[PDB]
Structures are given as structure tokens and as C-alpha cells.
Amino acid sequence: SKTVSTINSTDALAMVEHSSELTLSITTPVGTKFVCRTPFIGTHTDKFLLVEMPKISADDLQYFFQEGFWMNIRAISPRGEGALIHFRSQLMHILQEPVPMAFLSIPNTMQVSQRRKEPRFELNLAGKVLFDEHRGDCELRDLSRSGCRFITPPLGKTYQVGDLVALEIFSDLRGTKTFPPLTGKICNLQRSLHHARYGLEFNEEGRNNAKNLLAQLKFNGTKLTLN
Amino acid sequence: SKTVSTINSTDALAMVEHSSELTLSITTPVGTKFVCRTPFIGTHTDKFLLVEMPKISADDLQYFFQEGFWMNIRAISPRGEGALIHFRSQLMHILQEPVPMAFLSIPNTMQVSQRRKEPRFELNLAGKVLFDEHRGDCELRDLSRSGCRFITPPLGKTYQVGDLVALEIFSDLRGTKTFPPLTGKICNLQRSLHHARYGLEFNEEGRNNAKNLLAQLKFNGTKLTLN
């Protein structure tokens, strides 16, 4: 159900809401175990992870919360069905003024357990959605190896969960031609009179064409674009 | 289109993503105005709002960024159509170590500019959704003076945008009786094989039974409850 992978810390931490609770698990040099919880404050650029200083005892601070100690930290994300972010960081500084705060290092990567088994790439590619012999307009919004997200004019033809559609995405900026079709079934949808969005899960052929389409796209840093 | 209201700061800031950009506007006693932007780091409880030190001259820090100076701030929220949060804060401390940070006061309330015109209250009340004489199970998840959000079991009959339905919410813990119907039009829906959620807008009398239902409810700090 949950897939775990290694993600760069910036993207990992962007999934965590500021003020949410962090669970810090510490093991001292002699192996003494200690756990404490405290709110996440935020991050300064990529230099430090700031947390509210936990209310621990003087002995706790002395034996378990020393600058230089490394520790395992768990953070939660409430997005979708929810995800867990696990990483290891070193306690760098403790400030009592102007408010109690602890500064932890930000590692290069973190382990994320989430429901999505793979990433989805953002993009904006116009095309047509074929269903029951009829075509409507659509715009591809994200694409993964196994599916995609697309939107349509809210007043056009609507689709239902389970419907089998084929997305013919324009290969050129002139409309006319289209990449080999992305075929699959409607997995989810969100609609109103203002919006119509759909999550699609490809079938074998659709996966084949997705890989093909993806390969013909050039990245532009944040999104994929025609090329 | 955008409605402005005054919200407690904890809730307003929860709408802002850590690391997002803040726009700081400062006016000196002689009327010199300065505007700069810098990333929001987070907040320590309700004591301070932390931001990365804006990249500005000694000149500008001297005339516009002194401890004690007041400034009006604008933050962004990406939720839904997007929202703006405006508030006034006093610069309390500037720290250079271990990283450059400015500590601002957190006012009790903030002004939020958003698309929703009124608040929606969370709850969990079981009931039935009546449509063409048929009754499907449902759970009311939020309620406002003008509408509500409800979900149904995934295998339940699905409603379409524009459908006129009536929510018969159980008034007692044993089913049996219900509150006067919350009648209205399906405004939006999100659906998959495993979830079915709906946003509903009340008609005139429906708005009346919503007020009447609400008033018959007991508040419990976080959500409303029966009895």
C-alpha cells in the first residue's frame, strides 16, 4: 500500500506543514534510548531545521540532548491519505533567547513513505479526449509512467469513474498531429460547474505510449514541455 | 468575488506554506516607504513569527529594519483558488547567529481575503440523502449558513452537479428521527471507487433548516456534536 523512497530534503519538507509535530528518537553513545516530541517551526534556506525546544528535564538535556548528537526524526504529512517522512539529522545549536529553539542539520535526502508508487510530472499539454467515438478538449496536467491528470472545459462532455478514454495529445504547437494515444480508465474525478479534473490509470498500451511521450519531452527545470 | 474577514492568527497562518514569500511594507515616521520580500520560516508557538533576514543594504536595514519598527505584511495561501493574508507586526529581534533571522510579533488576528464568503464548521453526523424517493447513507462533514459537505459510502448512488437533494440528518443517536431537511443543489463532487464527497448549496428553505439544525447542536471545542 505504501511505497518508500529517497527524496531530496527540500521536496520532502515541503510536504510537512509548519507547526506539525516531530518525533525525535535519540540513542546516546552508551545506547540509552530517549524519545521526545515537539513542533516543527520551519527551515532557514537549506541551512537549518528549526524546532521548538522540547520541555525536557535538566538531566534529559545533559544526557540526551547535546549539540553534536545525531538522531532520527519522524515527520507527518496530511496530504491525501497521508505520508511519513523519516530522516537523520544532527543537533547543531540550542538557543534559549529570544525563544527556546533547537537547530538541526538538514540532510541531503529523506525517506518518504507515501501511497503514490512513483512520481507524477507536471506539464500543460493540449489535446483531445476520445470517448465513445466523440472527441472533447482536454489539457494534460501531470504524467507518470502509470497514469496522468487531465482537465476539460467544465461544460463539455463529462466522464464517470471507470470509463475507458484515450487522450490524443498534440505533438506540435499547431494542433494537427498527436502523440500515440494515452489509453486508460478514469480512476478519480473532481467536478463543479467551474472545473472538471480527472485522474486516469493507463492500461498496457497506454503505459507504452506514456513512456514514448515522456521521452519526447524536454524538461525546463520545473515542468516538462513540448520539444 | 473575494471576501475579507478577520481571523485568529493561528488559523490564518496555518493557511500559509512554510518557506513561502512574505511582502513587508514599512513606512517611517517621516513618510518614507520601503517594500521588500523575504521567505517565511515559521512561528514558535504564538510568540514569534520568524523570517529569513531580507537581503538589503546597511542603509536600508538602518532606516527600515530596526527593532521596534512596525510593518504591514502580506502572505499567500495556495489553497483552492488561492488567498491573501494581511497582518501588522512589530520587528522584535534580529539575530545573526546561527543564521540571519528576524523575529516579528504575531498579532491576535489577521485579515484573510478568500473565495469562501463564510466559515464552514466540521462535524460528523450520519443521515440519509433523499433523491427521487431513494435514500442513500451519508455523513455530514462540514456545515455553513449557505451549504455543507457530505460523503457517502463508496458503493452508494452517485449524485451529479446540479442534482436537487435533501439531507435528512439523524437528530438522535439511534437513527429514528431527523432534523428538518437540508435541501439544495449539488455544487461539486470528488469521486473514485473508494471515496464519494459532495459540496452542496442550500436553497432558501434549506438555509433555514441549516440555521435551525446548527442551533440544536452542542459545540465541543473543535467540532459540533449531537444532543
Swiss-Prot record, chains A, B:
GO CC, one annotated term: bacterial-type flagellum basal body
InterPro entries: PilZ_domain, Split_barrel_FMN-bd, T3SS_YcgR_PilZN
Pfam families: PilZ, PilZNR
Family to which this protein belongs: Belongs to the YcgR family.
UniProt cross-references to Gene3D superfamilies, sorted A to Z: Electron Transport, Fmn-binding Protein, Chain A, predicted glycosyltransferase like domains
Its biological purpose: May act as a flagellar brake, regulating swimming and swarming in a bis-(3'-5') cyclic diguanylic acid (c-di-GMP)-dependent manner. Increasing levels of c-di-GMP lead to decreased motility (Potential). Binds bis-(3'-5') cyclic diguanylic acid (c-di-GMP) with a dissociation constant of 170 nM in the presence of 10 mM KCl and with 100 nM in its absence. Binds 1 to 2 c-di-GMP per subunit. Only 1 c-di-GMP is seen in the wild-type crystal, while 2 are seen in the mutant. Depending on the concentration of K(+) stoichiometries of 1:1, 1.43:1 and 2:1 are determined by isothermal titration calorimetry.
The keyword Methyltransferase appears for this protein: no
Assembly and binders: Dimer.
Example of a GO MF term: cyclic-di-GMP binding
Protein name in UniProt: Cyclic di-GMP binding protein VCA0042
Location relative to the cell: Bacterial flagellum basal body
Keyword Nucleotide-binding: yes
Coiled coil: none
